[PDB]
């Protein structure tokens, strides 16, 4: 097998040859055919997060492919199913979160490519109770970003308490941003995109955004959004969480609205507690959703209502991709 | 004829006990004879004009004024004379926007506020909208029902927006008037109440009022670890009643993953926020002000059954400035009876 | 002055098109020059007086009267002299009961109804309450917006109380005056639609409007079996628009375990209900007839955005009786 | 060997047989049974008069509590000697939409205790470690067996009434489920009205926390009395013992927009006034025992001393007698220790 192993933090990933994993009880083995590249993989490679991985680990939580083995205890998943290995790898199974349909909040959970070896390889051992099952009518390259970006933005839009026909701003139309635009349009929600570029605003207009505001050349983007979204978006999905981005997001959401945050920035953002209380503003965090959310997002991608603009790549240029993310659609490694 | 009120002639200057004229009830408006008006930090902040949107002087503060209906407007339909009503913080609302039609009239924009945008309950008489006054339980005295109009409804709605259910842990941070009121409300909702405050007599007050877990912020290595230990993993809901600067960080540490932190205070300036922590833990941070008419009526029902009572420190109108002095360093309530 | 009005002089007798005094609004009231007026089976029942609570003749039926605001009473504050408004089923509410305070004025014990408890839209003028009249989008004419005051709001609220989410399955049964509106709303609200009806012109219309699944009730050995086949196990929401002993039983069969059955009709009599089946399957059965002011506003937003278009056949007042005869597509009494 | 009250064939007295003890194969736990509630579901499993009949010979009973006598291969979390229960739900598929949504009771390929696999009416029952309730330590097995079926059923039925603390829930038909539901709705911040055909049961409810009683027999109509003593109608109606009279009365008792939750499993159909049910906005939902999380929550209420089932101790060899007796105050719990 060939992987991209973070042997020591900070130093660039080296394309080594590591042994082929083999599944244990209730464990399947996936033959990766695509593997999305996310900024969470960059932060796992560098290691600048409170709780860190123990290198050498293989990153990547967007690996999709075939089941090439079942570890002799697996009941449902067959050998040939189109599966993927998302962020959530396992869970305890008995805590209040695992029992309430909220296993992403489990405190003993593992994370693919963070606490266990991930998608940046040919074969991965995964847990069949947590893998996502993929629709047939979608190729692996266009379904890999949905395993972390699609589910993240779908759950983020679900936690804004927004219904169809309500205004949701998608802030920072990147890869996650364009995926979120597609999901928000597929849910009946009016969309108002806000980014710093104008080509991305054109892309959002193509994707069903009826409102666009340039967050870099408008006098105040929040006033523009409140003008066009009938007095403030009912939900704001902040996709790339930065400063003046969280600020404009707080300014754009209408009273009683919800600011879902789908990024993991560093530092401590200021929060106008007075304004949040006076406006009844909810601010909620959400990293990639649960198994039901993943399944529903894969079903949105099986109807051709959400498509991921993907730039194919081999394994050997992963470093460059991280370089491209260090400076600043979606980069899917091509294992097929 | 004439009435006595605590007017704010200019911001930051001592409130003046004036003999202002009695307000008259406009068409669709009732006139209430105040009997016990509560004092809140909001009254001091309105008199001091230290908020982003400021009141317009001269104005009479006070949004916890309970009493009898002394007059009815030319057209009112459901509030009659003698109805023991209390004029809350939410004075009016437009009644046609997406918030007032949805039953979220406290989020409206054309809304007024008693004692802030209009004259309030620090007087012998007031003028209020009958569609927005609360209806008090007849088995509770005015002096004991005045704090419910702001403190009680604020903590009640704050507990309702924590999205907890009976049997869940709720940490009532900052046991002041709001803190003890919220302890009682969380007990009356079948929730297990952990209590955190720097003082200790207030922690014993929490103990008697229903709290089974009490943590002293001053004398623990870190209060959030004690809360997480004694609540089996962190409270499902945290209600920060006294958000000064670090109760917020302690609350964020106390809450469990997927839990909700509800803020009821109006502290100055901006507070840090571990967006990484709040996102990775699934935390929800929500801001809560008093609450709507349904929530006010529900809190009044709770105060009518005797499951929630406030410790009041009765005082007179002429002491208002002195009270405000004490408020620069137990819900204070004035007595017009 | 005088206006034309299809008065129900007494129950049983046919409607009498008469010259009746022009209704002048009073303190806190407005007047709506009725350009168009939809026709519903509720109006026929009011004309026939065959309900447990009956109207009080002579009364003017009609709860879909749209038009301009002609006059305003001394006191009105939000509507102006000439806005496109409509008078829906809900004419007033107490304002202070727990239902009104909670945003549920459709449940007020003291609600007045248009065309049932007070006069209505089957006339050239009406006196309505400005706090409860819907506000019409200006890009849709009265003829095509009259059905949205009863049918559109009814099916919108029914779909909302099915507790469904975008990507779910809702089975619309009875594609008629309500069913095609329901198909359009369920497609605009983001749900997968399955239509069920006895007729095949109705099924063709539904398949056009976005019903990915259509099953014929009378040309299928067992319909519910085929619906469950083509919905992966049944629908999370089942909207019964034409409530029948056949329709309700088939709806119970079609819904999935845990799903909701929304009954939007008002049939007569007492219907069978397998309590064992309901409890075992965890079925939920609700009943909603017309949505609230905010749900009306949301349905009007869907209508004005273009995502929902009623199919309308127009008439004049003078043949309302014939329509009532034909009451044994949505008829709209054009009188602009 | 054990003392299994086997249903060797449907319709016959249960043979008290010395069957072999089941063994904990891979991924399973074996429980030694110290107590076991008796429910009418067990009687209907014995008589097989339900649509999906069981398959004899089988051991009924879905309330068996005790210690984990043995742990099978692969099991990681449940230790031998833990106080576990074996509830109505035995297993689920683990991958369907209902399972992933926290609704594994709604599953299609689920198993049932004492209905589709051998159950609690024995000394040892082999259960699935992922679905066994984990009992508190301050409650006896004889007093915690009824919670596994009656307590969970009433708790979940109260939760699906979508009522909030301070609401009104009418508990119709005080029995085992009825009295446990009175206690649960009390421990939820809810006001509890009680309706029953006896009168000693109304006294028991009046003592267990209920504040409104109406005799379903000696009254001209229970619905009017309930509507008058709940101020317009109850927000929730938990129907514990369900019948054509009880269902009609419940639909009459509930306020508009309220939920009528059904816990019984009666044969046949029932009349539904669709005109009234649609005009009134009523919701008629049917609830069965409950999910693993709700079982945990019910056991937590039972441990904390807020819910106690009035257990009437029996032995194993008179189960048939109880079955005849079931053709009954409190919950007949067999004592197998
Ligand atoms: Zn990622
Ligand atoms: Zn867990
Ligand atoms: Zn206050
Ligand atoms: Zn408003
Ligand atoms: Zn009302
Ligand atoms: Zn209608
Ligand atoms: Zn049972
Ligand atoms: Zn399942």
Author numbering:
A (entry chain C): 5 to 332, 336 to 343
B (entry chain B): 3 to 331, 336 to 343
C (entry chain A): 3 to 330, 336 to 343
D (entry chain D): 4 to 330, 334 to 343
Q: What did the original publication write about this model?
A:
Here, we show that Paracoccus denitrificans assimilates ethylene glycol solely via NAD-dependent alcohol and aldehyde dehydrogenases. We report the functional and structural characterization of EtgB and EtgA, key enzymes encoded by this etg gene cluster.
The tetrameric EtgB is a class II zinc-dependent medium-chain alcohol dehydrogenase. We performed enzyme assays confirming that EtgB is indeed an alcohol dehydrogenase that utilizes NAD+ (NADH) as cofactor when converting alcohols to aldehydes (or vice versa). We found that this enzyme preferably accepts monoalcohols (ethanol, n-propanol, n-butanol) as substrates. The enzyme was found to catalyze the dehydrogenation of ethylene glycol, albeit with a kcat/Km value that is 300-fold lower than the kcat/Km for the conversion of ethanol. Therefore, we replaced the analogous Thr44 in EtgB with the smaller, isofunctional Ser to test for improved conversion of ethylene glycol and other diols. We also replaced His47 with Asn to probe the effect of this smaller amino acid on the active site and the proton-shuttling system. None of these mutations improved the catalytic efficiency for the dehydrogenation of ethylene glycol. However, EtgB H47N and especially EtgB T44S H47N showed improved catalytic efficiency with propylene glycol as substrate (ca. three-fold and ca. five-fold improved compared to EtgB WT, respectively).
